[PDB]
């Protein structure tokens, strides 16, 4: 019963190396501390704002890895090529409303530019996908409104199964 | 003008006989109440956590039987097999997320387990679909935050036409 | 950087004369206003509740006209022919839960009947979508509720391209 986490840092800025990535660095900080998560980083990587490249790494990470949880950071916002909750959508079987109306409800409680995040969260197989803005401080702000419910949410995809293995068996 | 009313429970649990349905139960016996929506019952049964069984009950009660409302209560949470939501995407007609906002804060108000709920509302024709929790308290308490503006979503949506019907016709 | 508005009003009845456009006249005075957006109106109609006659505008507007903002008012409640956030979801290529939120809660900080409010925001190219409802002070309250956000949200969006414009070239 161990947490095996993926983080992914979706930025055209990291993936060409003109930024450090904060932020992706911070959530692996924030979800290995055992008086927070405690889990393990099984997975990480910087990919750019192209919903294929998210789709395939999310694809992966669920169906082959099959992580507990994958926490994307950035592409959520109003730039044009901000995709990641786009590519979520293409990948989730079940969406988590009440998780992402938890993070924009915190959000719009510190700013109203709270209303310019689109996160998406959601379910496939056994894996919940998190929707986390870009920034270093967003990111752990809404890691920690929906901390609360991660660990229940967690046990309870346990045992669910990865449908490509199920249709092919 | 009478309401006339559809609960549909989902779960495997209950379905097997393992468990007694005091959620639906207890809907039946809130939506009858004078004091709080007076309709009357004019469909109930007991399906499993099986999307294709949830769907066809449904277009079947908004269809043939056109109920002006459904409360589904069930197959809300992460668990691998609650599909109630899913099943009642592939049905709906229009989208209420008021109605599903309404009893998400109001759970998250209670306790953030509340964001492992993943609630649907929605319309088919002149019928009305609420997603509820398949506990008895979360049910009731969940019925009683949208109440108030159930009697005119309700008288909205009398006039309104069974697709299936128009397009046949 | 100037922000060139739309504003279409969806009403069978204003589409008939049977009303005054109280609502869209009064949302093209607040726009224009420089104490709020400051904006200018480059495009107005009514059209009655047809789906395919709200797509077709909205898509108009967006890829030909190459509008900033278009705020929609009315038909998003629950009587049968409020289509007005299909319409909507068939046309914008990203969603802006937040500005949605950001409405309903306001609205339902109002009054109940605030979850009869069906809503949609959502992105295409470089504009910005709002579904307002059709009455004069809602509409108006509503804008109010995100007023804050529209600035900085049309400002990211002014160099996204359109995409029918790229897919050719």
């Known amino acids: ?28 900080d924030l979800v290995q501390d055992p008086s927070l998560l405690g889990g393990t980083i099984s997975a990480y990587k ?13 694809i992966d990470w669920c169906d082959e890895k099959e992580l507990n949880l994958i926490l994307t950071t950035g592409g959520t ?15 989730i079987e079940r969406e988590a409303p009440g998780m992402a109306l938890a993070m924009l409800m915190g959000s719009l409680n510190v700013t109203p530019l ?19 803005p870009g920034s270093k401080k967003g990111s752990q702000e809404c890691f ?3 901390l ?7 046990d309870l995809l346990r045992d669910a199964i990865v449908k490509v293995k199920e249709v092919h068996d």
């Not at 990919?47 to 999310?58: M, N, R, Y």
């Not at 995709?83 to 293409?90: D, G, L, M, S």
């Not at 609360?148 to 967690?154: G, K, R």
């Open 144 to 146: 920690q409104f929906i």
């Open 77 to 91: 916002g109003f730039a044009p090529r901000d995709v990641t909750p786009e590519a979520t959508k293409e990948v």
């Open 1 to 28: 019963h161990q947490i095996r986490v993926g983080v992914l840092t979706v930025s055209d800025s990291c993936f060409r190396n003109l930024a450090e990535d904060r932020s992706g660095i911070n959530l692996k």
């Open 46 to 58: 910087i990919v750019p704002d192209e919903i294929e490249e998210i789709k395939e790494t999310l």
């Open 148 to 154: 609360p419910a991660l660990p229940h949410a967690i």
């Open 114 to 132: 709270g209303m310019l995040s689109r996160p998406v969260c959601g379910i496939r197989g056994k894996t919940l996908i998190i929707n986390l």
